[PDB]
Ligand binder design. Structure first.
Ligand SMILES: O=C(O)CCc1ccccc1
Ligand SMILES: O=C(O)CCc1ccccc1
Lengths: 396, 396
């Protein structure tokens, strides 16, 4: 049965991990997959997380199955984070949340739900894209089409080209937006641009799907949700696939949520029934540990205070590395102004390197970035900055 | 977009949970979903598990993403459990294991892998069936057909009808077998019958898929894998979807594995590449905590000894409840010989109750069983036995 199966290429970001592991060169530097590293170049468990895990060790009395949609308190805390305490969406019971295995799991659940239960045939994503969107949506039988997004010459959001390319989207198409820290460009709509897109989306009949994996990493928890909230104020329906992987540094525990919004409580509950069916046909119920940690932290004032400071600390260290990167590139003799890197939000710099420059970086220098030219600024430290900048300058 | 979505019925086992929760009657008894309860009627975390969790709290230094196939040691320990230390399958590197979110996740991964990469169009399951097999395989676009299995009059495996009904399966069809503790009948092939089916399967060109969620609950860890091992000795290819939910009482941490077997190392590695692609398009990488616990216990002699005794203890308590159930039914005045219940393996008794008898049990008596007549013997205690048996006798 398996004799004639075609070989495939690996996940083009997660697959960097294996390459990096096999590399026996001592000075190798990982700027690939977007995980946060501290000053020492490691990716620690947050202190708030360790404290919550100690609590769970001492107080959990069962591993009995969670409901298909996971921990009720986790859903409640998620909706508050997404929409704001006192949101009309919450008051009017228009939102239902399933805890999922990561935002990736939430994306697949959304895709299966839409494919089976609606007339959706196409999802629009930005170019440049995040590779796994195509993989997930195609797996559920949905076409993926790309809209224009990034003006590579001014290093801004090309709002005109964005709007014009989306004129091709039909009513009933899905349009995927990154909530904040657009991956890979790090360029987000202004609040005013979010409000314009919200209005356009309503007029054009698009279904908004928010991929929201970086809440807290652009400006702050509440600020980063402004765009989503602008859409929520304007739409009857939308979906959010959110993640706690990055903002809790809980990557491997697979902690995310798929939140369904409809016009009213009757409609969302009936629709959510089919979302639960899409889960039943997949992994049945979500993993407790990571979601329990999140719910524990979010519902306890003291832990929440510690966690929010840790998140601020991560964002601030990345901002320091961002400035140091640009300074060091200059000092190392770069043949380009890299000032545009400062404008970018989140963990990355979308640096303008070509695919061949990134291949050479890996081959000759043991510096690992994504083929798109995306580099993980959150993986830079004072100790690895000089070598990595020397490498980049050498390939320009 | 969501206005016209059709309502659906809940997962017909997991959905019992909600019903049971809403029931405000004090004497309610849950004999539905197959989770183990101890003498006190609760479902404890195993001591071996708590010890492993303490170890992880004290010693984990990161939550960085696992590879798409999960923890390497977890795969190694899984293959040893499945095939035996020193198996030619392991020596010849013919097996590849992905850690998944439960056996349910492993079933979906297998289904997606097969649907996308092979000519498989149909999966054969037993009647009576486990409801979620149909849901999972249908979700990937595969037809599910049923083979005969249980002789309800002799309470044995109807081996003749099994073999005759499978004559309809074509070469290239998948045939799903439960490794041990067939759900819901509790009746398994003898070793000799396993060997006969292994031979038949090779002759007929079926792809064997083992659903192996109860290793340790029929007779013992090694004994329960005899049937799988009989198939592994005879086949070039097969798939195992295994679970640690029950044998580690780790239900909500979603700990399972999808193991792919091919003729040789080159074929399985190429095929496994596409299995990883099916994972990438789904939840991306598996949850660390529960799999870390399993790997920790399985690789440490002291913890492994404690865990294997805890598993023995669970099996033995269920066997005691099984005998007490039958005795109490007799004493309470049952109008049937229920001796056949003693022959059944695993957590359940497939009791012969009709769908209306189970509905009446829930409605009138607050005793919750599955609509098929399946009752969770592992949920019975000395304290709830009298009421539940009084209820059953009342509905006969
Ligand atoms: O590097 C990233 O783009 C974020 C981390 C990640 C990568 C691929 C799948 C899930 C998460
Ligand atoms: O009750 C069972 O049959 C086993 C527990 C279970 C039920 C449904 C999905 C996954 C596991």
């Amino acid at each position: 049965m398996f004799e004639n199966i075609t070989a495939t290429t690996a996940d083009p970001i997660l697959g960097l991990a294996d390459l990096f592991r096999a590399d026996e060169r001592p000075g190798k530097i990982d700027l690939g997959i977007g995980v946060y590293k501290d000053e020492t170049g490691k990716t620690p468990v947050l202190t708030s997380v360790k404290k919550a895990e100690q609590y769970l060790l001492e107080n959990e009395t069962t591993k009995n199955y969670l409901g298909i949609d996971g921990i009720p308190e986790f859903g409640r805390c998620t909706q508050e984070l997404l929409f704001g305490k006192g949101s009309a969406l919450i008051n009017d019971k228009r939102a239902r949340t399933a805890q999922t295995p990561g935002g990736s799991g939430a994306l697949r659940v959304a895709a299966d739900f839409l494919a089976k239960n609606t007339s959706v045939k196409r999802v629009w994503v930005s170019n440049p894209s995040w590779p796994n969107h195509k993989s997930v949506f195609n797996s559920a039988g949905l076409e993926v089409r790309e809209y224009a997004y990034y003006d590579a010459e001014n290093h801004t959001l090309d709002f005109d080209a964005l709007i014009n390319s989306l004129n091709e989207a039909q009513a009933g198409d899905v349009v995927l937006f990154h909530g904040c820290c657009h991956n890979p460009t790090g360029i987000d709509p202004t609040l005013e641009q979010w409000q314009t897109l919200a209005q356009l989306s309503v007029e054009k009949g698009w279904l908004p799907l928010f991929d929201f994996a970086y809440q807290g990493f652009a400006r702050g928890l509440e600020e980063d949700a402004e765009g989503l909230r602008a859409f929520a104020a304007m739409h009857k329906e939308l979906i959010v696939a959110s993640s706690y992987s990055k903002n809790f540094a809980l990557y491997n525990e697979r902690v995310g949520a798929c939140t369904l919004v409809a016009a009213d409580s009757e409609t969302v509950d009936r629709a959510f029934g089919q979302m639960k069916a899409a889960i039943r046909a997949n992994y049945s119920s979500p993993p407790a540990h990571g979601a329990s940690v999140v719910a524990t932290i979010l519902s306890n004032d003291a832990l929440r205070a510690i966690w929010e400071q840790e998140l601020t600390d991560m964002r601030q260290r990345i901002q320091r590395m961002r400035q140091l990167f640009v300074n060091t590139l200059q000092e190392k003799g770069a043949n380009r102004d890299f000032s545009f890197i400062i404008k970018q939000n989140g963990m990355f710099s979308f640096s303008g390197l070509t695919k061949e420059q990134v291949l050479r970086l890996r081959e000759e220098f043991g510096v690992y970035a994504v083929a798109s030219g995306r580099v993980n600024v959150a993986g830079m430290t004072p100790d690895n900055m000089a070598p990595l900048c020397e490498a980049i300058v050498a390939v320009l």
